[PDB]
């Protein structure tokens, strides 16, 4: 019996079977509900739209994200997300397939309680397990030691592991990722004359952020270059046919990852978070940590981020260390791909939470069994 890997991220649900490069269902985690007066009768009008169907008809819908910063708020919407990704995207019964689920660290435990109760009572499985995303990222990296910076759409977390031993006191969580960058890009696109206020326009701002933005190596030199000459300005076409051109906003938007005070937040950037997570570890393993930095998630897909992060850590680390950052082209789905590693492992078959253990222990064995 093949297992299931379902990364339920804040932005994109990535679901599929065991042992694939791409997740079989990659779609944004949105539930659409109509906000206008339906005047035509019949023609297959639906009260809700999930996935790319909501993306297609987004002009006449209000889109809701059931997951915000790794914590699921609306649960009936999350049940609709799971029912759509089981019965329609993958078209398989949940009663005959074990399902590995991912989780951000330092998540509230009631979220684990409710996903265990819903997964064992609404979409009742033979077994399910709740795992950490950074461990799967280190699996997909193909190594054992190293520090992982995961950055999805709600959660950016740093986890250091040495020889298979994670350090739970050194795990750091930062609620700053691509949704906050999309909101900041909405805030700074208003400067050039372009207004985007609705939830349907969030997809357009996210598409602009995905296509045109990049990470600058030196911030102030790129400010001087953008202010002096318009060589950095690039164009984009909206679906209504309008043409926009952006300059410095190509590299002001991801800079909030390296400078969180742009959106008004006290905590430090991702390179200071990486460095402080390194120095919280014991002193002997740090040389192994500096040469094995791992980035995963879609937020580190800008084509300037590895050289900038190397420059910042080499500024922070002492000069006798080789700062090597692993930045594969496959790192957008590597959180899923290491889930293909762990679910296919022969040593993982005894660690699943079965139906019977849930039946004596209630929905509380998931704390003592998982991380």
């Amino acid at each position: 019996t093949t297992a299931l890997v379902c990364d339920n991220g804040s932005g994109l649900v990535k679901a599929g079977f065991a042992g694939d490069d791409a997740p079989r269902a990659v779609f944004p985690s949105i539930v659409g509900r109509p906000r206008h007066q339906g005047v035509m009768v019949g023609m297959g009008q639906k009260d809700s739209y999930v996935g790319d169907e909501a993306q297609s008809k987004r002009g006449i819908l209000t889109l809701k994200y059931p997951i915000e910063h790794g914590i699921i708020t609306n649960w009936d919407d999350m049940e609709k997300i799971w029912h759509h990704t089981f019965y329609n995207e993958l078209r398989v019964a949940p009663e005959e397939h074990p399902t590995l689920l991912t989780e951000a660290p330092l998540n509230p435990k009631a979220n684990r309680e409710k996903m265990t109760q819903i997964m064992f009572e609404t979409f009742n499985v033979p077994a399910m397990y709740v795992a950490i995303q950074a461990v799967l990222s280190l699996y997909a990296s193909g190594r054992t030691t190293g520090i992982v910076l995961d950055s999805g759409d709600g959660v950016t977390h740093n986890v250091p592991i040495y020889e298979g031993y994670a350090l739970p006191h050194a795990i750091m969580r930062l609620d700053l990722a691509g949704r906050d960058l999309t909101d900041y890009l909405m805030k700074i696109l208003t400067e050039r004359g372009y207004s985007f206020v609705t939830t349907a326009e969030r997809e357009i701002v996210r598409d602009i952020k995905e296509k045109l933005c990049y990470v600058a190596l030196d911030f102030e030199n790129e400010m001087a270059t953008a202010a002096s000459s318009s060589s950095l300005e690039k164009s984009y076409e909206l679906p209504d046919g309008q043409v926009i051109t952006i300059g410095n906003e190509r590299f002001r938007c991801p800079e909030t990852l390296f400078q969180p005070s742009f959106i008004g937040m006290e905590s430090a950037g991702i390179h200071e978070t990486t460095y402080n997570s390194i120095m919280k570890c014991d002193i002997d393993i740090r040389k192994d940590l500096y040469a094995n930095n791992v980035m995963s998630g879609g937020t580190t897909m800008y084509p300037g981020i590895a050289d900038r992060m190397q420059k910042e850590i080499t500024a922070l680390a002492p000069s006798t260390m080789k700062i090597k950052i692993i930045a594969p082209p496959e790192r957008k789905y590597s959180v899923w791909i290491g889930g293909s590693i762990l679910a296919s492992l022969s040593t993982f078959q005894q660690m699943w939470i079965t139906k019977q253990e849930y039946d004596e222990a209630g929905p509380s064995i998931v704390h003592r069994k998982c991380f």
């Binding site: 065991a18 042992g19 694939d20 490069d21 791409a22 079989r24 791909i337 293909s340 590693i341 296919s344 492992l345 022969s346």
Partner: peptide
């Protein structure tokens, strides 16, 4: 030890890597 001395003198990885190419 004496009966032991008497009785003597007498893959996950390639399986997943094949199927990642299917997408």
């Amino acid at each position: 030890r004496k009966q032991q001395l008497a009785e003597e003198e007498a893959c996950v990885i390639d399986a997943l890597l094949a199927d990642i190419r299917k997408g």
